[PDB]
Structure 1
Amino acid sequence: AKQYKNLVNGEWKLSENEITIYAPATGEELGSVPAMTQAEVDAVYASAKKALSDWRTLSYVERAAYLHKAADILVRDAEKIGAILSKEVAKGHKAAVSEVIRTAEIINYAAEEGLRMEGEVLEGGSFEAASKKKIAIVRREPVGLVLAISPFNYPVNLAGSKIAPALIAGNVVALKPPTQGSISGLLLAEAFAEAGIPAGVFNTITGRGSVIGDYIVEHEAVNFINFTGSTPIGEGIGKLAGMRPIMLELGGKDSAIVLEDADLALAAKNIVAGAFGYSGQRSTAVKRVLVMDKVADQLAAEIKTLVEKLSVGMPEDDADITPLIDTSAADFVEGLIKDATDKGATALTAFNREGNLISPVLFDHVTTDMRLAWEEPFGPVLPIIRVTTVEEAIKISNESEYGLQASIFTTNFPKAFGIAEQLEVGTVHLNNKTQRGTDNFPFLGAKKSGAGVQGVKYSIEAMTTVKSVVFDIQ
């Protein structure tokens, strides 16, 4: 029952009230985080804006040095941090440690990507002859204070994915972790503090949404909002963003389109790995199979045999399927399962629920009148929807309010490229499950899946602006 503290202007601060964090899989009390007041948020932001001047005027090399050091510390403490991250969000122990290792890779990569970013020289004479001696020297500058809001399912990886790109460009950062995941976010903060990040350059905020939820976003000191979480929450942030740029990484309902010529065993392997990873609690994940009917029976059988083998149990045992993050999540997933059952879908694997541990449910013969065809479960349930034409698969895919990623399984890549052109998604994976990585690749979602382009170099670009200095050569 350790009492965790926020990093504020280089110091660690409790608050008068606290929030106790329990492990979703066991109920174990993991500790508490501060329930900051609005005035304490004011001090976090005041500290950040004060530190911005000296931070942005450091060299890229100096800023990159802090990031690399913090990544080295994360690697050192990956087992320690991952062990707690596992408990806090009911993520498998090994996956939790992997998340911290991956966070280190992102931080190091962002440091080296950002430090060699360049400006441009534009010629007046490109546009008008009379300005041929007028040139613009266009250099990059930070946007200022970035509010990073990490999600429960990747409370270290999708905190670092915002912090490091922000910091290399000369921004200051305040991290608001989710309450479930606040310990892991504060453990990440410990690595940055030990790396010697200058006071105020990076700070953390924890507290109850009823007290500081909107206040942290509406605060005029914030110049940029970088958020990962649910679609409805992301929509609420867009309403509070005003003129300030935002990045939103929200939900998905990624389709896996399986054509008649697909390698059905490989498609099943990727589909199951992608759909049921972390019990389906991922934005990027196969969430519906759109399969040509000629291969639907064989594919359903190949998916069923794998889903039946998934382990269902506790995070400490590295179970494939772990308890969902809270009771509301499991209730919602059970409801989608019940709707599909009641509307006549075929349950190829049996629904079971012990507490919030839902066994993985595979439905065949899902029709688009069923909620499970569209709504994001964030739970271990996968529908198979049979189609008769590629055109019908494209229409059903694009009919979703979500547009994060898609997978296309086929041996005809020229056709798959033509399909990918028509899919309203950010990324199409050919003969592979959907995935955010590799983290240098762009990561973006269309429609209700978010706004902005992430991936390392793209997140740095998003959190930098330009300063043009124009003069006339004589």
Structure 2
Amino acid sequence: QFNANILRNGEWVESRTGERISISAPASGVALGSIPALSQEEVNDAIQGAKDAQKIWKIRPIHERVDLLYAWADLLEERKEIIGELIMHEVAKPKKSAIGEVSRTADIIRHTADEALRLNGETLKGDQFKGGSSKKIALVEREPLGVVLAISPFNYPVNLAAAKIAPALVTGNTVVFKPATQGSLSGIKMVEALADAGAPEGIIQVVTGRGSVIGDHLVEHPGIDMITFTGGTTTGERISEKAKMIPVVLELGGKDPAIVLDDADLKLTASQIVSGAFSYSGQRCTAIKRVFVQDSVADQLVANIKELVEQLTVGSPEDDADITPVIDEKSAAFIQGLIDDALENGATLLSGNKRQGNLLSPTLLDDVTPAMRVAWEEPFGPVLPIIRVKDANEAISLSNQSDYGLQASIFTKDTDRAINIGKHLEVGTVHINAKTERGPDHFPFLGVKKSGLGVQGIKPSLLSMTRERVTVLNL
């Protein structure tokens, strides 16, 4: 198997404490390896090292740092098959979108380097403001914050790790990197390649273990200058609460509404709804989790959707199944408990209320109501609920009633109204006539309300991991 070490100041080490955590494959239950469970003291060592490595790192010329991201991305790509195999086993992701995770990461890395390389400064004259003297000029550059705490979830163990690391590193920051436990092995092998690519000692520090044990020690630590975090809303809110006096970026849970209207292409609506709701078996923060369909077209759409839900494969990740088993029992019983509240309240089961351990069949539900839990709570599994609506006004109200606000879809041939409906939605991104999604990666990515704080995507990521530095000359 894979009994892994962690990177601190350029060497691969274990816990001094000698203790590990076991990592199995969620689909088969089979042993993949282990990771060190690090103490708070080993977390102090990581943080202090990175701090000291940053002072040398910020000084490196900008092209030196981008050359590193480049060398790292090249390495990730030729390891796509292998890092790919690992991811799919570790977190049960279908083989192809798991190999495709590594490629995409490499792409995010280079594009991130490229965009760093053209952050320019700006000059301002004093007198561009009334009063302001004719003879002073402000030179405004961009400065790294210090040490970045980057915490990533299970569902994109490489992509969500690198998308935080890379904009932090290329802008002169150093990183302390905490992968989700399920996902650590893939995080580590990603960092393996960053160091074979010649990364300097201490610039990237990996901390592993008991996210419930070391979690706060990381988030509250004085050596941490900024935090990037992608995960659940609960853990998201605790970080926000327990970090202080530092920039903090959060991308959290979603309950992305799909508003389907009178005059939608129902074939395309159906294809896009399914594809968005059932990708990686519902286990995505950005995904359709809610459909609000006008009554007149409801039956048509619901049959259109049911037909595609029946098409979907369900089985092994090594097979490229559409539906694969969810992450653990915690999750699988939570999903099942959501279908439960729905059924015993009037919901019509249109398809697959089946459960084979962690393998949960693609569940489609009709006649869902405000009264039901599945209407509001992020399941993180392969269950989709359909709500029947009188008009767009009802669809917007129920959209905005969610505490979530990541992305929304509008399906309508009437493009003008679709844009004006979107303005009324309280989310980061609206998608007209298409499924919600984080990519392509150069597009800003954000949620609001309880879905997040801060803005990601290539260039917003770089912008948030730096601050303005001003030198005012007096000619």
When the two structures are superposed, what TM-score results if normalisation uses the length of structure 1? 0.99
Shift of 1:362: 0.4
Match of 2:12 in 1: 12
Tell me the equivalent position of 1:338: 340
Q: Partner of 1:107 in structure 2?
A: 109
Q: Give the Å deviation of 1:210.
A: 4.1
Secondary structure in 2 aligned to 1:448?
Answer: helix
* Whole-angstrom distance in 1 between the partners of 2:176 and 2:244: 19
Gaps of 5+ in 2: none
Aligned residue number for residue 145 of structure 1: 147
- Tell me the percent identity: 57
Q: Pick from 243, 247, 250 the counterpart of residue 241 of structure 1.
A: 243
1: CA distance, partners of 2:34 / 2:161: 19
Q: How do 1:110-121 residues align onto structure 2 when only pairs under 5 Å count?
A: 110-121=112-123
Cα-to-partner distance string for 1:202-251 (whole Å, 9 max, x where unaligned): 11100113431111111110100000000000001001111111110100
Matched, 1:405 2:417: no
- Structure 2 counterpart SS, 1:324: coil
Partner of 1:272: 274
CA–CA separation in structure 1 for the residues paired with 2:352 and 2:468 = 56
- Pick aligned residue for 1:299 from 289, 298, 301: 301
CA distance in 2, matches of 1:194, 1:414: 52
Which amino acid in 2 is paired with 1:271?
I
Aligned positions of 1:44-443 closer than 5 A: 44-443=46-445
Query: What is aligned with 1:451?
Result: 453
Query: How far apart in 1 are the matches of 2:392 and 2:154?
Result: 36
- Three-state SS of the structure 2 residue aligned to 1:64 is helix
SS in 1 for 2:175: strand
Shift of 1:135: 1.4
Deviation at 1:3, TM superposition (A): 1.3
- Does the CA contact (< 8 Å) of 2:73 and 2:106 recur in 1? yes
Deviation track 1:37-95 (CA, whole Å, cap 9, x = no partner) reads 11111111111011101111111110000001000000000000110110100111111
Q: Deviations over 1:277-312 (max 9, x none)?
A: 000000000001001111011000000000011111
CA contact (8 A) 2:274 2:308 kept: yes
CA contact (8 A) 2:180 2:211 kept: no
1:213 and 1:20 mapped to 2: Cα distance?
18
CA distance in 2, matches of 1:177, 1:60: 27
Distance 1:210 1:152 in 2: 15
Counterparts of 1:210 and 1:445, CA distance in 2 = 25
Gaps of 5+ in 1: none
2:253 partner letter:
G
Classify the secondary structure of the residue corresponding to 1:303.
helix
Q: Which amino acid aligns with 1:293?
A: D
C-alpha distance in structure 2 between counterparts of 1:170 and 1:391, whole Å? 48
How big is each residue's C-alpha offset from its partner over 1:392-436, in whole Å with a ceiling of 9 and x where there is no partner? 100000110000000101111111110111100000111110000
Q: Aligned partners of 1:260, 1:462: CA distance in 2, in Å? A: 41
CA distance in 1, matches of 2:436, 2:189: 29
| 1:350 CA displacement | 2.3
- Counterpart selection for 1:42 from 20, 41, 44: 44
Q: Supply the distance in 1 between the matched residues of 2:257 and 2:134 (Cα, whole angstroms).
A: 52
Deviation, 1:138, is 0.7
Deviations 1:310-338 (A, max 9, x none): 11111111111111101010000001101
Counterpart residue identity of residue 402, structure 2: S
Task: Write the distance in 1 (CA, Å) between the matches of 2:212 and 2:461.
Answer: 30
Q: Distance in 1 between matches of 2:418 and 2:243?
A: 38
Question: What secondary structure sits across from 1:148 in the alignment?
Answer: strand
Corresponding letter in the other structure for 2:13: K
- Aligned partner of 1:9: which letter? N
Tell me the amino acid that sits aligned with residue 123 of structure 1: K
Q: How far did 1:372 drift? A: 0.6
Q: Return the alpha-carbon distance in structure 1 between the equivalents of residues 147 and 366 of structure 2.
A: 48
Give distance in 1, aligned partners of 2:199 and 2:132.
48
Structure 1 residue 130 displacement after superposition: 4.7
The CA RMSD over aligned residues, in Å, is: 0.8
